[PDB]
Amino acid sequence: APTPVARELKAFVEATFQRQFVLTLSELKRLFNLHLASLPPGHTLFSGISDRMLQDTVLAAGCKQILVPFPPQTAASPDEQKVFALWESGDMSDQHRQVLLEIFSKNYRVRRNMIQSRLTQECGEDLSKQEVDKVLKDCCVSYGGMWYLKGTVQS
Amino acid sequence: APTPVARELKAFVEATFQRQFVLTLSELKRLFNLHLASLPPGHTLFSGISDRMLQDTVLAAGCKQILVPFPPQTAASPDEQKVFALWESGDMSDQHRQVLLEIFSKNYRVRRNMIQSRLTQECGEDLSKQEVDKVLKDCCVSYGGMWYLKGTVQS
């Protein structure tokens, strides 16, 4: 079957705006071409990607167009005048920490997998290794293969 | 001393939990004593601060007590068994960015002071230079003493 483009575009747009926050369509297209250089031949993003699809991906990913009023005599191109910005950053680190703390309301120590499973069940199956690693680094210490809240191990 | 006790203690507790996330009372007291070592004689925080007031300040700041079930045979002291945790970061990055972005919906370029004043008016005087510097670094570029959204200067 066909290999759809939307998820691949979204991953690129999300990485780009989380890093840079504000950029023009011109810069987004430049960065997209650099992204293409990293992809293997046969990838779906080598064909049939319009500027419209890129803009729709930006708006689908919690970014907004900022209607900056360029001066009358500007030489900036249309793409150089179209400005997008990260609106909501989507950092759910507070919520992950709250789920972990709820575990330790009922447990002194647990396996990593128990934490991962609880987070996945509560917060979503797309939870990343980086997000779990962060909440563990912030809140916990491991001893003997078990995970404790910081400062609660008595070795 | 020159400043109010609870206000000063609250500032210390907030900064400490934003850095450490999870602390026992024992560890919080250790960190407090390290803090006192840095302060000038006559500072209000050399006043008697009871453990109860310290805990009350943590709880009043929005940190939560975590009722971790310590094992029956633990040798942890009572203060080592009282666990507290940051519930919300207080990261207001998105809101500051949205204030700034609305400035550039009506302006191509502005002075830094204009952005600062707008942030102060919308958020309040409780914006650290660190937050203002961050929102400027994330969204903007300076050229000739004026501030623009990233990517919009025709350099």
Residue numbers in the entry:
A (entry chain B), B (entry chain A): 554 to 708
List sentences from the manuscript:
Pol III is a multi-subunit complex composed of 17 subunits. The TFIIF-like RPC4/5 and the TFIIE-like RPC3/6/7 subcomplexes are Pol III specific and can be regarded as built-in general transcription factors that play a fundamental role in Pol III transcription initiation and termination. A notable exception is the subunit RPC5, which in metazoans encompasses a long C-terminal extension (RPC5EXT, ~450 residues long), whose function is currently unknown. The RPC5EXT is formed by two consecutive tandem winged helix domains (tWHD1 residues 259–440; tWHD2 residues 556–708) connected by a 115 residue-long flexible linker.
To gain insight into the structure and function of RPC5EXT, we determined the structure of its individual domains by X-ray crystallography. Of the two tWHDs, tWHD1 is the most conserved while tWHD2 is absent in Caenorhabditis elegans and Drosophila melanogaster. The tWHD2 structure revealed a dimer formed by domain swapping. This arrangement is likely caused by the crystallization conditions and, in agreement with this hypothesis, SAXS data showed a monomeric conformation as the most likely in solution. Nevertheless, the two possible conformations of tWHD2, compact or elongated, suggests a degree of flexibility within this domain. Thus, one possibility is that, analogously to A49 tWHD, the RPC5-tWHD1 participates in an interaction with the upstream DNA and bound transcription factors, thus stabilizing the human Pol III PIC. In addition, the Dali server analysis retrieved similarities between the individual WHDs of RPC5EXT tWHD2 and the WHDs of cullin and cullin-like proteins, which are involved in ubiquitin-dependent proteolysis. On the contrary, RPC5ΔtWHD2 and RPC5ΔC were rapidly degraded with RPC5ΔC almost completely depleted after only 2 h following cycloheximide treatment. Several abundant phosphorylation sites have been identified in RPC5EXT, which, together with the evidence of structural similarities between RPC5EXT tWHD2 and factors involved in targeted degradation, suggests the intriguing hypothesis of an RPC5EXT-mediated layer of regulation impacting overall Pol III abundance in response to environmental cues that may have evolved in higher organisms.
